[PDB]
Amino acid sequence: RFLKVKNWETEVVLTDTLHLKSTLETGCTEYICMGSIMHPSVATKDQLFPLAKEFIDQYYSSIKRFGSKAHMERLEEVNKEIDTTSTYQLKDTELIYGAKHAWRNASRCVGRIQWSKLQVFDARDCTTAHGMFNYICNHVKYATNKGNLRSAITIFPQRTDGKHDFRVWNSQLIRYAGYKQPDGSTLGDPANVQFTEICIQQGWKPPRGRFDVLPLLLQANGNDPELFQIPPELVLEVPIRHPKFEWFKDLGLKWYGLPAVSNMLLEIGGLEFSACPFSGWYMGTEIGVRDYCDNSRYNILEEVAKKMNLDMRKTSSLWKDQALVEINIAVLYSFQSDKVTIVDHHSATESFIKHMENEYRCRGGCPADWVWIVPPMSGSITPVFHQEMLNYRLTPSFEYQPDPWNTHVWK
Amino acid sequence: CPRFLKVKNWETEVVLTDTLHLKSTLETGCTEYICMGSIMHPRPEDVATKDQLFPLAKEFIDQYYSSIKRFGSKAHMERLEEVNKEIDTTSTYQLKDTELIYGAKHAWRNASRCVGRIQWSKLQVFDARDCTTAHGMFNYICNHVKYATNKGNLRSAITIFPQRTDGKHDFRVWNSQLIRYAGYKQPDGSTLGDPANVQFTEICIQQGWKPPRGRFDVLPLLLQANGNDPELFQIPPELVLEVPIRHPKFEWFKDLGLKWYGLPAVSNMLLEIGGLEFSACPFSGWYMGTEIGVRDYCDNSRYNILEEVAKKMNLDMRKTSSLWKDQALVEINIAVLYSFQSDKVTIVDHHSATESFIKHMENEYRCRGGCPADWVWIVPPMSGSITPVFHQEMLNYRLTPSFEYQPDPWNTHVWK
Ligand code: HEM
Ligand code: HEM
Numbered sequence A: 001r002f003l004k005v006k007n008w009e010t011e012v013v014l015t016d017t018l019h020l021k022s023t024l025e026t027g028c029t030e031y032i033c034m035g036s037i038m039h040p041s042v043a044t045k046d047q048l049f050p051l052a053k054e055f056i057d058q059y060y061s062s063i064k065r066f067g068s069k070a071h072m073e074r075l076e077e078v079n080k081e082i083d084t085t086s087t088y089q090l091k092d093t094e095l096i097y098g099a100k101h102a103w104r105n106a107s108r109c110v111g112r113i114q115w116s117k118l119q120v121f122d123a124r125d126c127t128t129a130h131g132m133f134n135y136i137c138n139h140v141k142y143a144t145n146k147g148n149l150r151s152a153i154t155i156f157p158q159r160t161d162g163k164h165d166f167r168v169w170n171s172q173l174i175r176y177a178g179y180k181q182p183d184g185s186t187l188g189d190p191a192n193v194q195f196t197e198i199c200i201q202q203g204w205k206p207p208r209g210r211f212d213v214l215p216l217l218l219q220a221n222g223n224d225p226e227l228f229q230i231p232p233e234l235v236l237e238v239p240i241r242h243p244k245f246e247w248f249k250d251l252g253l254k255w256y257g258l259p260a261v262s263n264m265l266l267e268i269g270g271l272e273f274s275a276c277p278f279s280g281w282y283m284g285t286e287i288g289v290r291d292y293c294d295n296s297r298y299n300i301l302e303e304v305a306k307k308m309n310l311d312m313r314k315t316s317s318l319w320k321d322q323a324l325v326e327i328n329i330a331v332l333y334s335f336q337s338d339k340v341t342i343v344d345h346h347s348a349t350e351s352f353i354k355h356m357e358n359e360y361r362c363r364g365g366c367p368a369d370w371v372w373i374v375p376p377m378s379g380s381i382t383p384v385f386h387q388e389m390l391n392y393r394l395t396p397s398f399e400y401q402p403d404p405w406n407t408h409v410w411k
Numbered sequence B: 001c002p003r004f005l006k007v008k009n010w011e012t013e014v015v016l017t018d019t020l021h022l023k024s025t026l027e028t029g030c031t032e033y034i035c036m037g038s039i040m041h042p043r044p045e046d047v048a049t050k051d052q053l054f055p056l057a058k059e060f061i062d063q064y065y066s067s068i069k070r071f072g073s074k075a076h077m078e079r080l081e082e083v084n085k086e087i088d089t090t091s092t093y094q095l096k097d098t099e100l101i102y103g104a105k106h107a108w109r110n111a112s113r114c115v116g117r118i119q120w121s122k123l124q125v126f127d128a129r130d131c132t133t134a135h136g137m138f139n140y141i142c143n144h145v146k147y148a149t150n151k152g153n154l155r156s157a158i159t160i161f162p163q164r165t166d167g168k169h170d171f172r173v174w175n176s177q178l179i180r181y182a183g184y185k186q187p188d189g190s191t192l193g194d195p196a197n198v199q200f201t202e203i204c205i206q207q208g209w210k211p212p213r214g215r216f217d218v219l220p221l222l223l224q225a226n227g228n229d230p231e232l233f234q235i236p237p238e239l240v241l242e243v244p245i246r247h248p249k250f251e252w253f254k255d256l257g258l259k260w261y262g263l264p265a266v267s268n269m270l271l272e273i274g275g276l277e278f279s280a281c282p283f284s285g286w287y288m289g290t291e292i293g294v295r296d297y298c299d300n301s302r303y304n305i306l307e308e309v310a311k312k313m314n315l316d317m318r319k320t321s322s323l324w325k326d327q328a329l330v331e332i333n334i335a336v337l338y339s340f341q342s343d344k345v346t347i348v349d350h351h352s353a354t355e356s357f358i359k360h361m362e363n364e365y366r367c368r369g370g371c372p373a374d375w376v377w378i379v380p381p382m383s384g385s386i387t388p389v390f391h392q393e394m395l396n397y398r399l400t401p402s403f404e405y406q407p408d409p410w411n412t413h414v415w416k
């Protein structure tokens, strides 16, 4: 059936037909909704050809050549390859199409208005961690672009038997280390304490500061991962200051400009690309709300509210909320003053609404996860708050995968 | 369905095990292939047949006798038999007072969208099932308001009018809440008062209400008894506790002339207990500050005063990346909380409410086997991620007794 979604502020009603094309499961049933569960829970030739066919069919449908000679010949070509090798290889055009569409279908991403403007770097000829490092450096340098950030993805060889996976062990290409202190607390980013310890265990000499860029830990063809230092001139960073509080710079805060997810899995036509780092540019709340103010992260709200001299004895003074806004003002101001691309959550959500209208027009829908699309601060003064959304799983897609250290047979 | 479901809190690492979802009875709207958790609402003549009513009543009676540790008892089987004979001969049945009280508390306890449920067992239940006229409804509602307000020391309460029979004799409160301000559409397109209430205000005016046409005009009650045409009543102003909104630091905030009423009282929902339908069941609690300060004032299609506050704050309103809206939103919520506490009118901030909700949820998982919760509604509309519910995985499912939405009565009423 056709499904209607309404915006309760503008009263715009959109009609969704795209969800009829999905066949992956969401985790909900008719009796339990799992829409706020973070992760609700190697292929044979037998499963692989229907997945390949489905993808080839939508690729040739997208280029207005469904049922053509090229389409029929590609299907037969892919059929032979799965027969004789138990897998197949994507053409370059298919790889680009598949990566852009995995972004387009990412229901949790508020940034998808940009989806067709993705730079795709084919790294499927890589064989070693040294080659991986070269490809990643080129990605970072291209995507950073001296502050004028550009979306990019680098795609390393697909999974074969599951014993020869390419993996970026880092969760993001650029991240700060976290140090569990003798006296029990944490120096740096507490989210990275375990990864930091693996790097130390693997030989990384930690500088033991608050903003130490972690090395890359790179695994090629299932071998033991290897450490590499990203050349510092490639790592663009922004000192955080505030347009009114001159004391803010004294907090010593900074952040990196490039957000680059390096631990997800990219699935296209049944093939699994277990190393596929991709990067865009920040929405300010990703830094200033979650990275700085989550209790299990940098957790600086107390320090800032102290310097603002707010009454912190009772929660109903909203001292946390006041400090939070100023921290996010500082972040946006700092990036903008350094001419590093950043979007505030008002502009981002506004763009997402326009993106939804576009997708409902041209595509018949847009899968969207309200729990993730709505920003972590000031939710209801953004237009996504009042937007009904339908969440459903289309492919190509990005998926989570287990951490490599929980799997890796060390050698 | 799997027998255990685990939810995790990603900030504290606490993992909870849900088995209560095995008792869920009605649909969520989701399927295996689509989630509808952000959809707001996923014939009146049609009432439950005898055959539909028997098992719903037995399910409720069993749950009631299990709750008082008398399951399988003589009284339990006799109650089952008495209900079964009532449905047989009259096509309906009547709840005992104990059952009605148990049912109302559990509809609250089961309300997945309610962050205030740590209080569910303290609900004061007023039995108004002997009411026959709109004048009597007005009497019951006034008594409810006065009891719940309690001079600012608010107490949660519900008043339950007679259940639906054939669907042509419904009791209804046409107001969506017992206390709301009027909204007036002007010829030039602007709105005075509360823009959410323009349509209901117009209904009242057509029914004979003479509107004073101000910014904070309490709407009259529009009350329907026994399926008759609804009738207008004015709540005595001394029963409507109001709070003038001022700010602890900004002396100019009082000059905005704002105020709000103290008692939030939903009156358009349907209470379903054991297959019986109570179409008029107004219930009241106390406010979370953000329900006034974020939504009632800063929603664009509401009072929309972020502009005027930002102007008096002399904020850079040119670019959104100044976060002038976020900054004004906080100050308004500071003023609302300060104004209620100063006048000693019960209110709860979103930090305290969400923290209490996490403790309630943990207790319910331990004592009851789960706690249905709707993340989209439980997370507050400002500062979501600095409250503990943001990081709490939740399972949503529908248990009975429950509060349900029902159609607006002006769309279905057959005018006499
Ligand atoms: C260009 C600017 C972009 C912005 C502002 C943006 C913004 C966001 C935000 C705020 C989230 C929420 C996730 C979180 O809070 O951790 C998200 C999720 C996501 N983004 Fe985007 N993004 C951008 C680009 C991209 C690109 C280039 C890709 C892939 C090619 C992508 C793929 C995803 C995926 C897969 C998720 C889901 C992550 C998950 O499920 O945990 N995004 N994005
Ligand atoms: C005692 C203090 C209470 C507080 C602080 C509270 C708070 C809230 C809040 C913030 C919501 C979401 C509100 C919205 O955005 O519209 C809500 C929803 C709800 N509450 Fe509570 N509530 C309280 C008492 C009660 C009582 C006494 C009942 C019934 C006996 C109740 C039943 C419900 C229901 C059914 C909903 C869902 C409403 C809907 O779907 O529109 N609440 N509550």
Ligand SMILES: Cc1cc(CCc2cc(CCN(C)C)cc(F)c2F)nc(N)n1
Pocket (backbone or CB within 6 Å): A172, A258, A259, A260, A261, A278, A279, A280, A281, A282, A283, A286, A287, A290, A291
């Ligand atoms: C390409 C891309 C992805 C994402 C989403 C993932 C993502 C999320 C956060 C903050 C949220 N989380 C840590 C609490 C920081 C990041 F660096 C990051 F990659 N965002 C942006 N802008 N671009």
Ligand SMILES: Cc1cc(CCc2cc(CCN(C)C)cc(F)c2F)nc(N)n1
Pocket (backbone or CB within 6 Å): B177, B263, B264, B265, B266, B283, B284, B285, B286, B287, B288, B291, B292, B295, B296
């Ligand atoms: C008994 C009760 C119910 C509710 C939820 C319903 C409810 C919601 C709002 C918010 C306004 N909405 C348009 C955004 C104001 C209310 F008075 C109100 F009853 N809340 C509180 N505290 N108590």
Ligand SMILES: C[C@H](O)[C@H](O)[C@H]1CNc2nc(N)[nH]c(=O)c2N1
Pocket (backbone or CB within 6 Å): A008, A385, A386, A387, A388, A389, B038, B039, B040, B376, B377, B378
């Ligand atoms: C579209 C979405 O369902 C809608 O805006 C919801 C979102 N969450 C909400 N949460 C609460 N507490 N109250 C609401 O009215 C809403 N509205």
Ligand SMILES: C[C@H](O)[C@H](O)[C@H]1CNc2nc(N)[nH]c(=O)c2N1
Pocket (backbone or CB within 6 Å): A036, A037, A038, A371, A372, A373, B010, B390, B391, B392, B393, B394
């Ligand atoms: C439990 C809940 O699903 C979890 O905390 C989610 C909520 N929404 C989110 N939304 C975004 N954008 N990013 C997140 O990490 C989360 N976390």
Ligand SMILES: [Zn+2]
Pocket (backbone or CB within 6 Å): A028, A032, A033, A034, A035, B030, B034, B035, B036, B037
């Ligand atoms: Zn769902």
